[PDB]
Amino acid sequence: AVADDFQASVMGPLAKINDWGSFKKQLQTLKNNGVYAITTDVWWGYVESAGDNQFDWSYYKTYANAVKEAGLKWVPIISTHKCGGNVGDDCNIPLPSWLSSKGSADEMQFKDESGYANSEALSPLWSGTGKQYDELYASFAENFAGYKSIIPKIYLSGGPSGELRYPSYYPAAGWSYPGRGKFQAYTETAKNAFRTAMNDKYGSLDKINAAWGTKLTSLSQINPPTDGDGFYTNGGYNSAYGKDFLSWYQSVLEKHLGVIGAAAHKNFDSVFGVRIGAKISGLHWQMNNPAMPHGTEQAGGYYDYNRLIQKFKDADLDLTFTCLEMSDSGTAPNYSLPSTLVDTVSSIANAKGVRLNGENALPTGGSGFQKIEEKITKFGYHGFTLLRINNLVNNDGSPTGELSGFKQYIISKAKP
Ligand SMILES: [Ca+2]
Ligand SMILES: [Cl-]
């Protein structure tokens, strides 16, 4: 069964609201169907665009006012990531542009196996990332304290697309599905952080060689994989070196979760006092590829789900997972097993007492709702958020054909 406190929420639209009357009609219809809350990307690029610590919350106060007036709860996602920004993308909401003048690009960004630089979110390795998020959370808390009664939960963005991961798969870097993507530790800052991490762990270059079986003559010859595709088949993954690299690669995300979690708790616990959550990506493809098993997950930063989910527990953050609507396939060439992935992550979270919340990866309907229903009831989910509002209600406020199924399968699980 779903958890005793289960509620169904719906993600708001991607595009900035420019017709408030239309959005209000949509909100009324969702409320009339028993929807609990609206989840909302609160874009960093919208709210601190003019300068460091120069805030503009007015659009989101309007947004929150509309949600409140419709009798809905509001679940803000503090979205410290970029939306699109490449020609043809369906949004263009970059990080605040002044950030570029505050630290070195190398320390602030991600670089892939081929040298492609990605700026979808600030690197956890930048000294200024934690400080910037702390200021932003403080500002949110200060500006939205008067909205306490309508905010039941707050989400953090742990990286690209609001997910705690590396920007490992990116169309503008040459990626297309079902590519495993690429490791994202090729900035000098990342390479040096890995060298420093290994020197700290083993104590010297010679002790690193002792652990790895290598014959390096300087720390500067230590690098991330210089060929990611064959990282399993070439003995990389199974090697002491490969395990050290992947563990470290994941540890960067884990420390980041700790930092942003602590900043969120510090700013929110005495103002809102609600559950705070973050999201793990559903990297469901290349799971069972014989030549690169779990290659997509690994490039994204996922080496050990037990340990990663333990960090959620330690940081006292709830876990949102995705792909709840998808079925297992496992066939070449996609090697995609999202339903098994959901079971894996969900089972681990429940074993640890980490509260689960769910989302669909892609717009869905029909059988998608029955799959979501299976997951939320098998694993005692505390919430489900449907992406997105226009898949349930048209601009004029009329239901799509899917609202009925969403209501019958999902909303009906909630106590009103
Ligand atoms: Ca700031
Ligand atoms: Cl946009």
Summarize the structure.
This protein is of the alpha/beta class and 416 residues long. The chain is 37% helix and 12% strand.
Secondary structure layout plus pairing:
Blueprint: E1 7-11, H1 20-32, E2 37-43, H2 44-47, H3 58-69, E3 73-79, E4 83-84, E5 92-93, H4 105-108, E6 110-111, E7 117-118, H5 129-144, E8 153-156, H6 188-202, H7 205-212, H8 240-268, E9 275-279, H9 295-300, H10 305-315, E10 318-321, H11 338-352, E11 356-359, H12 367-378, E12 383-386, H13 403-409
Parallel strand pairs: 1-2, 1-12, 2-3, 3-8, 8-9, 9-10, 10-11, 11-12
Antiparallel strand pairs: 4-5, 6-7
Helix pairs in contact: 5-8, 6-7, 8-10, 10-11
The structure holds calcium ion and chloride ion.
Calcium ion is lined by residues 48, 52-53, 132, 135.
Structure description:
Helix 5 (129-144) runs parallel beside helix 8 (240-268) and helix 6 (188-202) packs across helix 7. The strands form three sheets. This protein has an eight-stranded parallel beta barrel, surrounded by five helices. It contains 13 helices and twelve strands. The longest helix has 29 residues, at 240-268. The protein has one domain (1-416): Glycosidases (TIM Barrel), CATH 3.20.20.80. It has helices spanning 20-32, 44-47, 58-69, 105-108, 129-144, 188-202, 205-212, 240-268, 295-300, 305-315, 338-352, 367-378, 403-409, and strands spanning 7-11, 37-43, 73-79, 83-84, 92-93, 110-111, 117-118, 153-156, 275-279, 318-321, 356-359, 383-386. The protein is 37% helix and 12% strand. The protein has 416 residues and is of the alpha/beta class. It is globular.
